[PDB]
Design a protein around this ligand. Structure first.
Ligand SMILES: Cc1cc(Oc2ccc(F)cc2OCCn2ccc(=O)[nH]c2=O)c(C)c2cc(C#N)ccc12
Lengths: 547, 401
């Protein structure tokens, strides 16, 4: 009998100040009891468990569904925290093409790994005897129980420790490790590859790990985690979109999720009009009608999901390129590729929740997103093709009050182009009329006034109902813009209005602000000056709008 | 050679902090470095029984192509028990010149308390989550930890004792992995003495505090004023009135009377000139009742002025500046705002370390996502400060210009 290499156990403790679980065993049918007796008998014969004496205080409930099911929920609540490296999964677009690839799924994953003996007394459980006229049959685990909190991490660590020397001795092959599966790949010949796979499963057999003996149970195409993996390409598993004349909130969430999942390879996927209906959530039962925008959007999604699209694999010897296009309404779409028309992957970016915004900022955010995603997937930052002129970005970042940066990029011309719509003067304009504006509202009656006086004698005061101070201060500026020439100087005391305009939005949720923007766009030169209120500054009249 | 027991604060579990994505070259650098460190017993591989994690990444210091490993021990530092204290050398900021040395290599000699080692756990990440990350824990004193210098205080004292007894006019301070040495010598003599101290540390960044001071509020001097000029002046004075008590602007605002054009020239009255002069006199004086409170946080605000110029203010209570300044140094940063901001934050933090012996909390004029994406690419400092992000443009920008 060839000795199998010993697998060192991982020391495990319960959470501090806690003790092992004691739970009353559930009553079972005689059939269930017999089934469990047989199963646990063969398991005890296999060494997975062992009978224990009455000394052990701790107990876990067991069920039969025959297949047994030990409910470790309480022990899981009482077991220590573990390090989980399973956050995130490998993305197909990040894989490098290999001439020969093998998939190995280890049978009896958790039952091949020994458990810390000082912890085995906490995994104890009992089998109810017939009619309960005898003491229940007591058992404890000697290996990792499936359903336990610590099983995946320990199994993973053990597997890694076992695989390390083979990997070190084989730089010519690459091994990916995921749960109960190993994915080997090489650019070697098929014979040499199969040979090295035999070597690997032998090396695993030395530690007592079983791999498929036959021709490996899975061959291309591989269906894995919503993906379809083919030898020369990857894609997603076929999309399923339910069609019903009555939609609930949960159905909306599921549809949104599905579309998001499809959007990583299918370019042009949009999800705004459907996500807007997720306001006032937490109620899963409801009937929400769809607008024409949402219906045409979903029809467009059915139009894109009409024919299959494939992504390619990654070649480190070629440059990494990300191109971005504006879709409108705060929506952005991007394609990451190396060869033209052949995408590695695709994606989208929706603007965040804000009162005001402009295209350049959103583009920047998109760039940051794509950058982080790229670093995760390929470990490098891609070169960018952006629908924005170099000179535009120059003016923007040079005059922007915030610090801002984009990595290496070039201008692609694919309209709509991102542009700066208006620019304020840094100095007062000579020969331009000077509009001193002001607005003020009554807090109680919600009645206000907004207007201006100018150096040429031009005046205006407009009365407003249902308004606030800020609204009148904006309204005054808007009035100054409406009734002035192509060039204009504007004086205001509103830190609010100046605060808004100095953020340079090209779009807003306030109609008044949008109109102010539309006015600015029509102007040639605009100088916006600020002064303190109620300082008795001449030309600035609070008394004119306070009547 | 003897480990001193180190615990955490009551009711605080060890740090669990997500490791952020790293580029391939940085990952390889960290692999090489940590392998070499593992062969030297400085760190050891750990198992899944360790839940704790601290972020880690790679940088390149000044005048060096060699990658350096940097651990973000911030969370572990704030979760580490308070170590007690040496009063800050207030004479350090008063010295003519100060040189900063990297005494980090000395920490790897002293072993770390075993029971505490599980809290210094970190992870080298992999690209595309192909393989699980490599997990290490420290065996010796880690660089970047606040406990490491506190433990090495005695050792450092015994080592620097002869040099201290030799030159009583030389101030020596220690912060984290850095050793600040101040004096009044000549740059050549400074460099040679630094070589002497370095060789003294071997067998066992010129910074001039005198060329930096606080800054006053200055007002323009003009022969002729425009309506705009006077409006900006009145604005700045009205602002400064929040700081200086006796500022009045009524005689200047009286000039603006009526609605005139912004470019129209207004001659000043005698009352206005008098008021302006009085305001000048007021501004020439320092600020009333401004003190430093060691029990309070230091706040640093940074404004982007454009053309490579940046202004900053360190304070505790609003309108009570403890320090003001203007970083406009240009090295290789011409096309990159974020690099400029990062170097600015580093310099300000350094100054703060020299003056008060602790780092300030920053308020950065940058979007969170941008900064979080790019700040590690230009960070040469062994420590890290705390920061937040101001999303609303300040009006005071040109008032510090
Ligand atoms: C994540 C991964 C990699 C992999 O394979 C690879 C394993 C190691 C490597 F270095 C490189 C791989 O792939 C590069 C790309 N690729 C892919 C499939 C193919 O047929 N040919 C090919 O070239 C395979 C089979 C996988 C199989 C499953 C399943 N079921 C799930 C995840 C897989």
């Amino acid at each position: 009998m060839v000795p199998i290499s010993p697998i060192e156990t991982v020391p495990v403790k319960l959470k501090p100040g806690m003790d092992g679980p004691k739970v009353k065993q559930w009553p079972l049918t005689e059939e269930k009891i017999k089934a469990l007796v047989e199963i646990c008998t063969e398991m005890e014969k296999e060494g997975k468990i062992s009978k224990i004496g009455p000394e052990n205080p701790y107990n876990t409930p067991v069920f039969a569904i025959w297949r047994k099911l030990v409910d470790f929920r309480e022990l899981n609540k009482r077991t220590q925290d573990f390090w989980e490296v399973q956050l995130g999964i490998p993305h197909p677009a990040g894989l490098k093409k290999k001439k020969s690839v093998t998939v190995l799924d280890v049978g009896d994953a958790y039952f091949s790994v020994p458990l810390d003996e000082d912890f085995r007394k906490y995994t104890a459980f009992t089998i109810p005897s017939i009619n309960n006229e005898t003491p229940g049959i007591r058992y404890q685990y000697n290996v990792l129980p499936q359903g336990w909190k610590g099983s995946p991490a320990i199994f993973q660590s053990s597997m890694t420790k076992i695989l390390e020397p083979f990997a070190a001795q084989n730089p010519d092959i690459v091994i990916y490790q995921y749960m109960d599966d190993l994915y080997v790949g090489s650019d070697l010949e098929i014979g040499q590859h199969r040979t090295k796979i035999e070597e690997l499963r032998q090396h695993l057999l030395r530690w007592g790990l079983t791999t498929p003996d036959k021709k490996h149970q899975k061959e291309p195409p591989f269906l894995w985690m919503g993906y379809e993996l083919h030898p020369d390409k990857w894609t997603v598993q076929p999309i399923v979109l339910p069609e019903k004349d009555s939609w609930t909130v949960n159905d909306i969430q599921k549809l949104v999720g599905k579309l998001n999942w499809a959007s990583q390879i299918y370019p042009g996927i949009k999800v705004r009009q459907l996500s807007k209906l997720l306001r006032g959530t937490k109620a899963l039962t409801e009937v929400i009608p769809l607008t024409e925008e949402a219906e045409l959007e979903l029809a467009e999604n059915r139009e894109i999901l009409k024919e299959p699209v494939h992504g390619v694999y990654y070649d480190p010897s070629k440059d990494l390129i990300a191109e971005i296009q504006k879709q409108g309404q705060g929506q952005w779409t991007y394609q990451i590729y190396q060869e033209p028309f052949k995408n590695l992957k695709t994606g989208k970016y929706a603007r965040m929740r804000g009162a005001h915004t402009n295209d350049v900022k959103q583009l920047t955010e998109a760039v940051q997103k794509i950058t982080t995603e790229s670093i995760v997937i390929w470990g490098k930052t891609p070169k960018f093709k952006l629908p924005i002129q170099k000179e535009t970005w120059e003016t923007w970042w040079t005059e922007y009050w915030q610090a801002t940066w984009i990595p290496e990029w070039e201008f692609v011309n694919t309209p709509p182009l991102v542009k700066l719509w208006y620019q304020l003067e840094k100095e007062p304009i000579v020969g331009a009329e000077t509009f001193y504006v002001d607005g003020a509202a009554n807090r109680e009656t919600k009645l206000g006034k907004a207007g201006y006086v100018t150096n040429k004698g031009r005046q205006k005061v407009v009365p407003l109902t249902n308004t606030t101070n800020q609204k009148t201060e904006l309204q005054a500026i808007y009035l100054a813009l409406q009734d002035s020439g192509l060039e204009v100087n504007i004086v205001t005391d509103s830190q609010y209005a100046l605060g808004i305009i100095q953020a340079q939005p090209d779009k807003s949720e306030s109609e008044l602000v949008n109109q102010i923007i539309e006015q600015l766009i029509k102007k040639e030169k605009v100088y916006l000056a600020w002064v303190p209120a109620h300082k008795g500054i001449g030309g600035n009249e609070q008394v004119d709008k306070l009547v | 050679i003897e480990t001193v027991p180190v615990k955490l604060k009551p009711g605080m579990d060890g740090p669990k902090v997500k490791q952020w994505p790293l580029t391939e070259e940085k990952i390889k650098a960290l692999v090489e470095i940590c392998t070499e460190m593992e062969k030297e017993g400085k760190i050891s591989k750990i198992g899944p029984e360790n839940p704790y994690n601290t972020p880690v990444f790679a940088i390149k210091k000044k005048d060096s192509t060699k990658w350096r490993k940097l651990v973000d021990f911030r969370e572990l530092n704030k979760r580490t028990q308070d170590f007690w204290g040496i009063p800050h050398p207030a004479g350090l900021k008063k010295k003519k010149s100060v040189t900063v040395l990297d005494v980090g290599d000395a920490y790897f000699s002293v072993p770390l308390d075993e029971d505490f080692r599980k809290y210094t756990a970190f992870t080298i990440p992999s690209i595309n989550n192909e393989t699980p990350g490599i997990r290490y824990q420290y065996n010796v004193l880690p660089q970047g930890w606040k406990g490491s210098p506190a433990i090495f205080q005695s050792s450092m004292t015994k080592i620097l004792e002869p040099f201290k007894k030799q030159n009583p006019d030389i101030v020596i301070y220690q912060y984290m992995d850095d050793l600040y040495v101040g004096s009044d010598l000549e740059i050549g003599q400074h460099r040679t003495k630094i070589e002497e101290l370095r060789q003294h540390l071997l067998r066992w960044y010129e910074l001039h505090p005198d060329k930096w001071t606080v800054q006053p509020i200055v007002l323009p001097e003009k022969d002729s004023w425009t309506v705009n000029d006077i409006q900006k002046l009145v604005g700045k004075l009205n602002w400064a009135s929040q700081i200086y008590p006796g500022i009045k602007v009524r005689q200047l605002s009286k000039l603006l009377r009526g609605t005139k054009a912004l470019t129209e020239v207004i001659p000043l009255t005698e009352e206005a000139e008098l008021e302006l002069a009085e305001n000048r006199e007021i501004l020439k004086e320092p600020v009333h009742g401004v003190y430093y409170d060691p029990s309070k946080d230091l706040i640093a605000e940074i404004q982007k002025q454009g053309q490579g110029q940046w202004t900053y203010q360190i304070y505790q209570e609003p309108f009570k500046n403890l320090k003001t300044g203007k970083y406009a140094r240009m090295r290789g940063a011409h096309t990159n705002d974020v690099k400029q901001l990062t170097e600015a934050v580093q310099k300000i933090t350094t100054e703060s370390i020299v003056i008060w012996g602790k780092t300030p909390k920053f308020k950065l004029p940058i979007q969170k996502e941008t900064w979080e994406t790019w700040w590690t690419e230009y960070w040469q400092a062994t420590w890290i400060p705390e920061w937040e992000f101001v999303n609303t443009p300040p009006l005071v920008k040109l008032w510090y210009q």
